[PDB]
Amino acid sequence: ALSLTADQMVSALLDAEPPILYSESMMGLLTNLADRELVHMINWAKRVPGFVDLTLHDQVHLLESAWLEILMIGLVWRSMEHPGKLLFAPNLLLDRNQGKVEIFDMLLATSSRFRMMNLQGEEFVCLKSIILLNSGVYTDHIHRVLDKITDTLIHLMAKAGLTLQQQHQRLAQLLLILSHIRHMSNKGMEHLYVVPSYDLLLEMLDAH
Amino acid sequence: SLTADQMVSALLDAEPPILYSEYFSEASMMGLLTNLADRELVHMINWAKRVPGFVDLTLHDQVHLLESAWLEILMIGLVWRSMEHPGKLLFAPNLLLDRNQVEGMVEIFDMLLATSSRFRMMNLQGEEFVCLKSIILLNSGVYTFTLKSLEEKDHIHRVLDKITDTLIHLMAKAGLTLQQQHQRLAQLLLILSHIRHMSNKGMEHLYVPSYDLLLEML
Ligand SMILES: CCCN1CC[C@H](CSc2ccc([C@@H]3c4ccc(O)cc4CC4(CC4)N3C(=O)c3ccccc3)cc2)C1
Ligand SMILES: CCCN1CC[C@H](CSc2ccc([C@@H]3c4ccc(O)cc4CC4(CC4)N3C(=O)c3ccccc3)cc2)C1
Secondary structure (H helix, E strand, O other), X not given: OOOOOHHHHHXXXXXXXXXXXXXXXHHHHHHHHHHHHHHHHHHHHHOOOOHHHOOHHHHHXXXXXXXXXXXXXXXXXXXXXOXXXXXXXXXXXXXXXXXXXXXXXXXXXXXXXXXXXXOOHHHHXXXXXXXXXXXXXXXXXXXXXXXXXXXXXXXXXXXXOOOXXXXXXXXXXXXXXXXXXXXXXXXXXXXXXXXXXHHHHHHHHOOO | OOOHHHHHHHHHHHOOOOOOOOOOOHHHHHHHHHHHHHHHHHHHHHHHHOOOOHHHOOHHHHHHHHHHHHHHHHHHHHHHHHOOOOOEEEEEOOEEEEOOOOOOHHHHHHHHHHHHHHHHHHOOOHHHHHHHHHHHHHHOOOOOOOHHHHHHXXXXXXXXXXXXXXXXXXXXXXXXXXXXXXXXXXXXXXXHHXXXXXXXHHHHHHOOOOHHHHHHHO
């Protein structure tokens, strides 16, 4: 799994992207959307190179720690080309006045930062994979997979013609946004208080 | 226009002192810890004013950054002081606690010990530590802030890019390959995500310096 080249890493992550779901009272709608997204997030996670080499127990615990950050970065990515709004679904585009908002504004600020940086889709899927592997790690294989996502990000920035200086500056800019995504997830849990159970996540993993 | 070497030296020179507790009971512990944190906050203000680029910001923005970052900064300082003492948190040289020494305190205690362990595994260097602490100051509040606010953010990101350049410089100096430099840069910056996590958890557990207090010292 660690033998993939950088381009093969990118290709695998792009191929594993989950579909964009539609909405089926605001907060029942958004909860139900999140619930349906979580199954597709599990299928995605199983395709992040290195993830399924962990025990099922450690897979579940990484998902327990990461699932809200992953929903949020996906939302921010979708909303990136809709200034001042959040595209929860293609049939569910909300502005902040429908938000009444503190967390809404943080998400909008993240999407605008992504817009400023002209975040690329190949960079997005790497960041999402880092969240998966990193959010639960504090609580050797995981670190080896994280290092090769770093190698892959740097490879993408070199391919785009950035200087070596610009590469490390951009790498750092992107990883600092992950601190803000963590902050939003923490404030989001406080607001939503919700957590998918160990057994629910385990069932969606569909063990052999 | 500071070089990386000048950035490192300025940050090392700005380091606050390690403070002591007064010269044990569980019942007085939180009072001692709060008194220590209060005294450290005064020195943290002086340190912040010496982080290159910080005092170029408006007073209002300086307060907002410190408002967002002060707990993360106390926490990373504690983890650094604790790094050579496995299983312990060295709040002060005369206040060294283990995890057996309040509801929800041990959960945060454990996250801090895990950060200390991570520092040891990576053999974190003092020059890297001071860079990380300056990044926290400039970054933690930069997504929760007019033409003046756009100029401020620009400056903050230019200072952050300089610190990235400085970290890479330090790592290259230590003989790391270029792959190893990027890998370690990422490893260090991902630690900042965990420090943010502990700050949010800590705020929940502690429930704070006022703007006027921060403005008065600033
Ligand atoms: C078994 C039941 C457990 N399920 C139920 C709990 C657990 C799910 S709870 C839950 C999770 C997510 C949301 C949505 C939602 C939905 C889809 C998506 O892609 C993103 C978001 C973003 C956001 C999380 C911040 N959100 C809000 O509503 C929000 C947005 C901006 C400001 C404030 C609140 C809503 C509810 C799993
Ligand atoms: C008038 C403004 C009020 N002042 C404004 C600053 C003051 C704010 S409150 C406050 C801040 C800090 C702590 C200490 C403390 C002290 C010094 C230090 O270097 C680090 C720490 C770490 C830690 C914060 C997590 N802590 C705990 O006790 C703790 C530790 C592990 C698990 C759980 C709790 C304690 C209280 C109050």
